[PDB]
Nucleic acid binder design. Sequence first.
RNA 1: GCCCCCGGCGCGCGCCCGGGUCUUCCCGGAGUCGGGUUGCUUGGGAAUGCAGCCCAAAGCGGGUGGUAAACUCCAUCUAAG
RNA 2: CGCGACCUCAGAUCAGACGUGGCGACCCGCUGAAUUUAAGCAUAUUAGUCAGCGGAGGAAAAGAAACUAACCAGGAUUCCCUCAGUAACGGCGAGUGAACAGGGAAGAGCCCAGCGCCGAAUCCCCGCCCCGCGGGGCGCGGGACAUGUGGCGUACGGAAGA
Lengths: 205, 203, 97, 117
Amino acid sequence: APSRNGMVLKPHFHKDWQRRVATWFNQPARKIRRRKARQAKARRIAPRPASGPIRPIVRCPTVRYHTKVRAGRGFSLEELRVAGIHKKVARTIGISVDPRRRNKSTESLQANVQRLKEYRSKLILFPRKPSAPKKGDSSAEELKLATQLTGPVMPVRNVYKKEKARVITEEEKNFKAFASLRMARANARLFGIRAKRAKEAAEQD
Amino acid sequence: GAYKYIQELWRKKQSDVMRFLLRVRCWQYRQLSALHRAPRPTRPDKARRLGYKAKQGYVIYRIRVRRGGRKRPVPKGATYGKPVHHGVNQLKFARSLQSVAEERAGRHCGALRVLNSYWVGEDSTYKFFEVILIDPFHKAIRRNPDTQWITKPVHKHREMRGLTSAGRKSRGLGKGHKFHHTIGGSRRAAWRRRNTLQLHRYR
Amino acid sequence: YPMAVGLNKGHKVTKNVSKPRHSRRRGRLTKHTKFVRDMIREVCGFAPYERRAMELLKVSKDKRALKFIKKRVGTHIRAKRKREELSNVLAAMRKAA
Amino acid sequence: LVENKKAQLVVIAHDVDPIELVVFLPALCRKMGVPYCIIKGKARLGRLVHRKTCTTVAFTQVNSEDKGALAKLVEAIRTNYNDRYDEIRRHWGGNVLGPKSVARIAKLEKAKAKELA
RNA sequence: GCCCCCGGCGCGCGCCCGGGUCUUCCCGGAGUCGGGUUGCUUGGGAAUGCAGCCCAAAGCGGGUGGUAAACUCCAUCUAAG
RNA sequence: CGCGACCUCAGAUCAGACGUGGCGACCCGCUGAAUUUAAGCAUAUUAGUCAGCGGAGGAAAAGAAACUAACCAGGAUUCCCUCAGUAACGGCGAGUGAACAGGGAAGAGCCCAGCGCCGAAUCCCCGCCCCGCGGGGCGCGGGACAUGUGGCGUACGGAAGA
Ligand SMILES: [Mg+2]
Ligand SMILES: [Mg+2]
Ligand SMILES: [Mg+2]
Ligand SMILES: [Mg+2]
Ligand SMILES: [Mg+2]
Ligand SMILES: [Mg+2]
Ligand SMILES: [Mg+2]
Ligand SMILES: [Mg+2]
Ligand SMILES: [Mg+2]
Ligand SMILES: [Mg+2]
Ligand SMILES: [Mg+2]
Ligand SMILES: [Mg+2]
Ligand SMILES: [Mg+2]
Ligand SMILES: [Mg+2]
Ligand SMILES: [Mg+2]
Ligand SMILES: [Mg+2]
Ligand SMILES: [Mg+2]
Ligand SMILES: [Mg+2]
């Protein structure tokens, strides 16, 4: 079968694929199902925003993506506890709750507490009975719009650094190096044996 | 108070005090028939952590199965295939014996709904189980909204679609790197979407 | 002078030394259930591999006894633990005597 | 109540057929020091509770006129059970054959005694 | 415009102590996990999962962390409801 | 001898309920070939598919981690774009073939045994009344379930008690 110069092609068509093929001609219909599903979700609720649970702020776990940031799933129980509010109180406020999430980094941890202080500043709620506890006055006709768009706070807003200008100094262009990667990379590979070779040097005696 | 002690005494099931009690009860059940009613569960701890609350509506059918794998039903071992498929005497049947014990009970009494099952003995050839059964129409279970859920008829014949704890441990579902073979719902719904071709509008 | 590779690997950050999870408090020996097992040990006894191992522990060889336990239970990690667990049986035999 | 010394006399039925519900009791009352008695009739414990079987009754709060009744018994109950716990630890019952084969060995004694006589 | 039905405010029933810190004690699923082997399956290879047979658990424990096997340090989860 | 209790049991045209069978496109649990291809043919491939057998619903299944990770770390499932015809498999031949990331759709999370505390504080049936129509329920007396342990607070994110 093969011939003059061409690439080896191995397609996966020995398996009788024509019985099992999903065809996307139902693609405009579901798209109109789903706008009319979100808009049916829009006019049920009330003043509360669609996509209304607020999400936390989470850095992306790898070496590849950890220089960007992402709306996670739920505020940490210990994050949310620094704001001081109880668990199932908080979901009625409209905050997402996640028990699985730790907090190793207080720069991460306090950044979400600032976000909850933001949202609880942001919040205009309504009571059942106007006994005036954590409630709102006649407030900007339900604050000028009932519903928000794509999260309440624009969760990405990925923060950039300027560090605008500086003079270059002595002893940085004198000392820094390529080689202080290579010296340190080779330092890490030999920490085990350099510990042991000197340990059996003094164990010899 | 004592359900920790029953648990711990039934835990070590090789000592003298218990190996008598296991060996007599292995004799005790073998002279009875294939399916009958134990009036109350003979491991009252173990039934209770599976869902037995000692009131009306819950039956125990002590049930018996034979050990061993399965022999393929081709006549004289003539299997008429390639030299892989001469597997006559050594095939071992992708369900457990406990799941077989759940099947025979619940289809014997189709009024009832299987909940779970547990181990009560094996000596040479037989292997004896109990099966806890829920009557989805008695008023003790159609009230009490903890356990209303088993009436709603998507839970009809839970054992024979493989849905009890004996059934989940059959299909092999879990999470992570040890369970990639069944990535949505089941291994057949895994194969369906991992070998559907997506033939698109704009491709 | 940070470093992406090396022995001080990655971005230098602030720890959050705080209270652990509760689920780590799982197989703790829990003075209630200390009582239950060491009451039920004097009820039941031992298993036939364990009793012969305690006859093997005395006179035969320590190393044969562990190769016996590792042949009866799963791993070398469990054969150590079962030999330690039965040693404190034997110590309470002949030194509470 | 036995684990916290909160009862003073323990009455155990004879016939609870899952025997697992028993064999941890007489060592536990041994280690705690609450006197126990093994008594006959699981229904007979039920008749003083208005129930079918009852399996266990712990005398906890004695009356005024009844402590003098109690120590008159707990003397007698320690006399059999609690003091002889090293004896009850090694009763290996059973191993009794049938009277057909027992009478066979007894007749086998007579001829073997006829060897001796 | 005519009939029929259903989802959005209000007289009577049924029910009701919640939040923080400190002191005290409480805190768990077994012939199951694991190990042996044998079949089948998977991309899973010094065995991904299932299953039979035998052997059979522990509590600072248990499973995992992708090359078998120890000596570890640590990460992470809480199985057999 | 005679009674009484309980447990194992059986009998009924007993009082009242329930399952059976059907359609089977989509879903779920087991069982399972072969033609085909390798230019032959066994492993492989066809394919864990057609056929066989059992169960259910308008969806099912799955599901609130004995997870991924390996660093500034994520955080139930299901589905789509990518990862990818890639790591891996394989007479390393013919071929087969994942996943975590990342971006979307959608987003909802909880209970029980055990541990003890509350005197079984719980439950079913019958009897008699209450109530308004369209029909099914709440207040009183007896008969059972039930200590071989119903119910209330309780779930590993801790919880309880003072
Ligand atoms: Mg050509
Ligand atoms: Mg074909
Ligand atoms: Mg009954
Ligand atoms: Mg094109
Ligand atoms: Mg294969
Ligand atoms: Mg551990
Ligand atoms: Mg271990
Ligand atoms: Mg390691
Ligand atoms: Mg959990
Ligand atoms: Mg040809
Ligand atoms: Mg195949
Ligand atoms: Mg078919
Ligand atoms: Mg049917
Ligand atoms: Mg239907
Ligand atoms: Mg659905
Ligand atoms: Mg489930
Ligand atoms: Mg590519
Ligand atoms: Mg294949």
